[PDB]
Design a protein around this ligand. Structure first.
Ligand code: CLA
Ligand code: CLA
Ligand code: CLA
Ligand code: CLA
Ligand code: CLA
Ligand SMILES: CCCCCCCCCCCCCCCCCC(=O)OC[C@H](CO[C@@H]1O[C@H](CO)[C@H](O)[C@H](O)[C@H]1O)OC(=O)CCCCCCCCCCCCCCCCC
Ligand SMILES: CCCCCCCCCCCCCCCC(=O)OC[C@H](COP(=O)(O)OC[C@@H](O)CO)OC(=O)CCCCCCCCCCCCCCC
Ligand SMILES: CC1=C(C#C/C(C)=C/C=C/C(C)=C/C=C/C=C(C)/C=C/C=C(\C)C#CC2=C(C)C[C@@H](O)CC2(C)C)C(C)(C)C[C@H](O)C1
Ligand SMILES: CC1=C(C#C/C(C)=C/C=C/C(C)=C/C=C/C=C(C)/C=C/C=C(\C)C#CC2=C(C)C[C@@H](O)CC2(C)C)C(C)(C)C[C@H](O)C1
Ligand SMILES: CC1=C(C#C/C(C)=C/C=C/C(C)=C/C=C/C=C(C)/C=C/C=C(\C)C#CC2=C(C)C[C@@H](O)CC2(C)C)C(C)(C)C[C@H](O)C1
Ligand SMILES: CC1=C(C#C/C(C)=C/C=C/C(C)=C/C=C/C=C(C)/C=C/C=C(\C)C#CC2=C(C)C[C@@H](O)CC2(C)C)C(C)(C)C[C@H](O)C1
Ligand SMILES: CC1=C(C#C/C(C)=C/C=C/C(C)=C/C=C/C=C(C)/C=C/C=C(C)/C=C/C2=C(C)CCCC2(C)C)C(C)(C)C[C@H](O)C1
Lengths: 40, 42, 60, 170, 161, 194
């Protein structure tokens, strides 16, 4: 298939296990900063 | 822009001064960001 | 030669020796140098025309 | 003939009603030397900036955006010089003014009215007669606002109170 | 190393050059207070001097007895970045300028007034030519072999003797 | 005879609404000095490179080839980490593609010598997806628009990686606003140097 067990293609998750909006903790999105600026 | 003023900017002393000022300016900028290049680094 | 033809000059003391000029007129009299040739370069004297003999002029 | 505005001053002679809002007022004679399309370009540009500035000076007193700290407009100039917002505004104005340079060249070449950028999104200029009255109002408001903006900034300097609060006090 | 020279990273005289150059700047810095603009400027110079000496030490340059870096230009590949590779870069730029200027002179010959094109340059056509120079070796060699670079001896004006 | 994009300017000559994406947008009149065929070749080329580049940034953030040399989420770091030999192999392969696909007509003076040559049309249709001539106009239009959008988007992604040292969608999901103390713009001559 061109890729063996060793040297397999690497697929990761950018989202990092959190949402677009209304997050809590070590995850603060661009949309959350839009909400943060609008309430200040 | 006026075609006679653009024809004046196409005269030899103006283009010579602009081209070598541009040339001088990117040598100056290259020696600002990358100074003291005595050798090709390799 | 003919008028309006392009010619290569073969006079070794010409300014335009081995360059191309154009034949202006050709005299029919007993003239020593009957071919009138014009050039685009000026000579050191600023002249751009000269008389030549047939032998001195070759067509290109 | 005599100037309509100043009865005892003669009419300038380059000002024969060609430009709306002309009242014949030009004593120092800048239209006898300079191009009136360029001068009307400059009058309308200075006037539009001034009209926006007076609205900004008052609205900025009434409200300011939550993400920015509250402060007076001259202090706003200095804060946004040091903050970075001023450079953004200068850059985007400069960007628009590039196509404004092209527009002024089009005016000099005869194919554009001096303040015309074809900016009528809301279709307010319904008819040509309405446009003539509207541009007379624009010229009058532009001139009045140039005077007004000078007053607000200079008075703020002399007495450190904002325009709405200076009307409110004294 | 080569020709009895010493690599600059272990020559002690290169080290004394660096130390004397920094003491010369530090004694000028000793006359100014910390946050002043002359103090900041001299500290920037001290950092720049140290950076230059450190870089030269790790570059493979060969210092002499004087402690100044020397250039080896006999053709060996371990020193090609001192003359051979800068030379290849130069010849590419110089051949570009020559090819582009020649192309404009040949265009200007076919103009309505050929001498007006050289004191009042046709900038769109001349910029068209300046862009073409990136493949000057191939364009110029194909020009040569097609009999269009070199003119024959009998279309060239010469002196009587 | 006014421009449609810029209503207060006149319509530029060499822009006649024939080309796809022709909305009359040429305020600086580049088309009056530079032939429009060369400009459309350059626009299509820039746009295609950028389309791949924008997709490159996003996919490189998500999917990687194996190995530690290819584990660079931030795309600006991939430039330095990826093997030099293979990167220069890419550069040399690009050069060979440029000379062959253009058929040795590469210079401004010689490209388009053949009257059959069309701006942006290199003959590239491996799967004959443009065989239908009914789809030709909207394909040309959407190629031009995808190229323009991707030029703007890749420019944004590269300079947002410069400002924020984060890969693009991870920057969107772990967003941090500019302090303004860092990344000062200009200033080399205001302080008189240093
Ligand atoms: C033909 C003779 C000649 C040669 C070969 C050089 C070559 C060089 N000079 Mg010298 N120089 C020359 C004439 C010459 N110069 C003359 C006539 C003057 C007097 C105006 C100078 C004054 C001068 C100064 C003051 C400096 C140089 C520097 C340089 C280097 C610049 C490299 C560069 O551009 O990288 C720039 C970066 C790129 C990526 C390109 C290079 C080694 C600079 C240097 O680096 O010294 C080692 C430097 O500081 N030169
Ligand atoms: C659409 C294009 C665009 C882009 C990409 C930017 C990008 C930026 N602007 Mg600019 N700006 C633009 C258009 C744009 N501006 C226009 C059209 C105007 C009106 C003339 C301004 C007026 C402006 C001001 C007045 C300010 C910025 C600021 C900023 C910065 C925002 C920092 C941040 O992301 O956190 C905040 C994120 C958000 C607000 C999310 C939305 C950034 C450098 C600010 C800054 O910090 O400058 C350094 C600032 O104060 N901009
Ligand atoms: C004065 C005459 C002279 C000339 C013309 C040369 C010419 C050359 N020398 Mg040098 N050399 C000379 C004297 C001379 N040398 C002396 C007196 C010494 C001291 C003994 C050296 C020591 C020396 C060394 C130690 C080396 C050279 C090398 C080279 C070659 C490298 C240039 C190149 O890119 O070609 C070759 C590359 C290509 C044709 C294509 C590259 C792309 C070149 C033929 C190098 C070499 O490869 O030897 C042949 C090498 O390693 N030379
Ligand atoms: C681009 C035009 C051009 C080209 C292709 C050449 C080519 C040549 N010149 Mg000539 N030359 C030129 C311009 C040019 N020259 C100009 C403008 C001058 C007046 C200063 C001279 C004065 C001159 C002398 C005195 C000598 C040569 C010699 C030579 C030959 C060897 C290379 C050399 O010595 O360079 C030397 C180059 C110079 C001394 C001056 C070059 C000045 C600049 C860098 C080039 C001109 C740039 C031009 C404005 C391009 C604009 C392009 C734009 C319109 C698109 C070669 C035949 C030599 C020779 O006969 O050897 C056999 C020689 O002795 N040249
Ligand atoms: C003359 C033919 C040739 C040869 C002998 C090599 C030899 C090498 N290359 Mg390659 N390379 C070539 C042409 C060649 N290259 C061309 C033409 C390109 C440009 C497209 C590249 C781009 C390239 C990159 C980017 C890399 C190499 C690497 C390597 C080295 C390790 C190879 C390995 O482990 O393979 C075993 C591994 C595989 C077979 C994995 C294959 C991965 C897939 C197929 C990638 C998908 C290709 C993609 C669709 C490309 C489309 C663009 C293209 C059509 C233009 C090896 C020295 C790597 C290196 O230097 O590492 C030290 C590396 O990172 N090369
Ligand atoms: C043959 C091919 C078939 C392919 C079929 C699939 C593809 C079909 C096309 C799909 C096109 C995209 C559709 C979405 C796909 C993913 C769905 C999804 O779950 O998304 C994933 C994310 C949400 O992800 C959620 O995460 C949560 C945990 O945090 C949950 O636990 C789940 O993980 C998940 O539901 O969706 C979004 O972020 C949507 C954002 C909002 C999008 C618009 C909403 C509707 C429009 C109104 C908005 C108005 C805003 C005004 C301004 C507000 C400013 C603040
Ligand atoms: C089609 C593509 C469009 C590209 C748009 C460009 C976007 C970015 C442009 C700058 C953004 C905002 C700048 C604020 C940043 C800013 O203005 O900093 C200010 C800087 C000068 O420093 P100062 O005197 O302001 O120092 C001020 C003190 O506050 C700090 O010490 O201005 C410059 O000269 C920098 C630009 C280089 C000028 C030469 C550029 C190279 C010339 C090449 C030929 C001309 C090209 C165009 C030149 C303008
Ligand atoms: C063009 C266009 C459109 C538009 C638009 C916009 C944004 C139009 C905005 C227009 C504005 C803002 C006009 C404002 C004029 C201000 C004036 C006349 C000054 C008054 C102050 C005075 C006289 C004073 C004073 C005083 C002094 C100095 C200091 C005080 O202590 C005392 C005192 C108060 C007495 C839209 C988008 C609608 C669409 C449309 O299709 C095309
Ligand atoms: C020409 C030009 C254009 C353009 C363009 C551009 C910008 C084109 C860019 C093209 C690119 C980026 C091509 C990339 C190719 C990558 C390859 C072949 C990877 C090979 C990996 C290998 C061999 C491996 C490995 C392995 C190693 C060694 C060890 C392991 O530990 C890891 C691993 C297992 C993975 C276009 C078309 C747009 C228009 C116009 O016509 C002008
Ligand atoms: C039309 C017109 C106008 C206009 C205009 C404008 C705004 C024009 C702007 C045009 C632009 C934005 C052009 C962009 C070019 C970018 C390219 C070719 C990208 C190359 C990147 C590559 C090869 C890569 C890569 C990489 C990948 C992805 C992976 C990384 O790990 C590594 C790396 C970073 C190397 C004006 C106003 C002038 C007026 C005029 O009268 C009318
Ligand atoms: C033609 C042809 C074929 C083909 C083919 C191919 C390879 C077709 C592939 C086409 C592709 C890859 C198109 C990609 C377009 C990318 C776009 C429009 C991105 C715009 C980004 C924007 C607007 C942004 C942004 C961003 C910024 C700046 C701020 C960030 O914080 C976030 C954010 C992400 C929002 C094949 C080979 C099949 C054969 C066929 O016979 C002929
Ligand atoms: C530098 C600085 C800033 C600034 C700033 C600014 C914008 C300063 C403002 C400058 C302006 C707009 C001054 C206006 C002067 C108008 C006058 C004197 C009217 C005279 C009318 C007369 C004499 C009579 C007229 C006549 C009479 C009888 C009435 C009819 C009309 C007429 C016949 C003509 C900040 C705010 C950015 C802060 C920053 O950190 C540094």
């Amino acid at each position: 298939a061109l890729f063996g067990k060793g040297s397999m293609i690497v697929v990761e998750d950018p989202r990092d296990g959190c949402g677009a909006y209304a997050n809590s903790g070590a995850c603060h999105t661009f949309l959350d900063e839009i909400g943060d600026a609008l309430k200040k | 822009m006026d075609s006679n003023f653009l024809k004046y900017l196409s005269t030899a002393p103006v283009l010579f001064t602009v081209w070598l000022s541009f040339t001088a300016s990117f040598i100056i900028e290259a020696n600002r960001f990358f100074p003291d290049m005595l050798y090709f680094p390799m | 030669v003919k008028r309006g033809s392009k010619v290569r000059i073969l006079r070794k003391e010409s300014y335009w020796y081995q360059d191309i000029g154009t034949v202006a007129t050709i005299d029919t009299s007993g003239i020593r140098y009957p071919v009138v040739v014009r050039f685009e370069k000026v000579s050191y004297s600023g002249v751009n025309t000269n008389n030549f003999s047939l032998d001195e002029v070759v067509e290109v | 003939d005599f100037s309509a505005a100043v009865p005892f001053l003669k009419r300038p002679s380059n000002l024969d009603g060609a430009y709306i809002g002309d009242v014949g007022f030009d004593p120092l004679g800048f239209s006898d030397v300079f191009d009136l399309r360029v001068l009307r370009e400059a009058e309308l540009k200075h006037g539009r900036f001034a009209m926006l500035a007076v609205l900004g000076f008052i609205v900025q007193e009434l409200y300011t955006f939550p993400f920015f700290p509250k402060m007076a407009p001259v202090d706003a100039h200095d804060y946004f010089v040091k903050q970075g917002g001023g450079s953004q505004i200068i850059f985007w104005i400069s960007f628009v003014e590039l196509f404004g340079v092209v527009a002024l060249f089009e005016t000099l070449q005869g194919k554009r009215e001096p303040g015309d950028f074809a900016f009528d999104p809301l279709g307010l200029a319904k008819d040509e007669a309405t446009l003539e009255r509207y541009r007379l109002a624009e010229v009058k408001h532009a001139r009045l606002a140039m005077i007004a903006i000078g007053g607000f900034i200079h008075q703020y300097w002399v007495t450190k109170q904002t325009v709405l609060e200076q009307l409110g006090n004294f | 190393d080569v020709a009895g020279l010493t690599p600059c990273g272990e020559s002690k005289e290169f080290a004394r050059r660096l130390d004397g150059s920094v003491k010369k700047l530090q004694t000028r810095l000793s006359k100014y207070e910390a946050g002043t603009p002359p103090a900041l400027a001299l500290q920037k110079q001290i950092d720049k001097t140290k950076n230059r000496f450190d870089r030269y030490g790790k570059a493979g340059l060969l210092c002499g007895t004087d402690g100044l870096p020397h250039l080896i230009t006999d053709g060996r590949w371990t020193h090609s970045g001192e003359f051979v590779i800068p030379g290849l870069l130069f010849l590419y730029v110089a051949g570009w300028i020559g090819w582009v200027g020649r192309s404009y002179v040949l265009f200007a010959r076919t103009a309505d007034k050929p001498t007006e094109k050289e004191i009042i340059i046709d900038v769109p056509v001349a910029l068209s030519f300046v862009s073409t120079g990136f493949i000057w070796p191939f364009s110029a060699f194909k020009e040569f072999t097609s009999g269009n670079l070199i003119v024959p001896a009998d279309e060239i004006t010469v002196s009587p003797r | 005879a006014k421009s449609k994009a810029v209503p207060f300017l006149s319509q530029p000559e060499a822009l006649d609404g024939s080309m796809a994406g022709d909305v009359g947008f040429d305020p600086f009149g580049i088309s009056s000095v530079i032939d429009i065929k060369w400009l459309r070749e350059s626009e299509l080329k820039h746009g295609r490179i950028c389309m791949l580049a924008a997709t490159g940034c996003l996919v490189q953030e998500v999917v990687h080839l194996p190995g530690p040399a290819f584990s660079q989420k931030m795309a600006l770091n991939a430039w330095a980490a990826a093997p030099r030999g293979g990167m220069i192999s890419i550069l040399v392969a690009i050069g060979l593609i440029e000379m062959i696909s253009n058929r040795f007509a590469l210079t401004a003076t010689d490209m388009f010598a053949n009257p059959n040559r069309v701006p942006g049309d290199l003959g590239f249709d491996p799967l004959s997806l443009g065989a239908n001539p009914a789809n030709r106009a909207r394909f040309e239009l959407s190629e031009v628009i995808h190229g323009r959008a991707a030029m703007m988007g890749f420019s944004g992604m590269v300079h947002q990686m410069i400002v924020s040292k984060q890969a693009p969608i991870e920057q969107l999901m772990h967003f941090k606003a500019v302090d303004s103390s860092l990344m000062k713009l200009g200033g080399a001559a205001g302080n008189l140097g240093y």
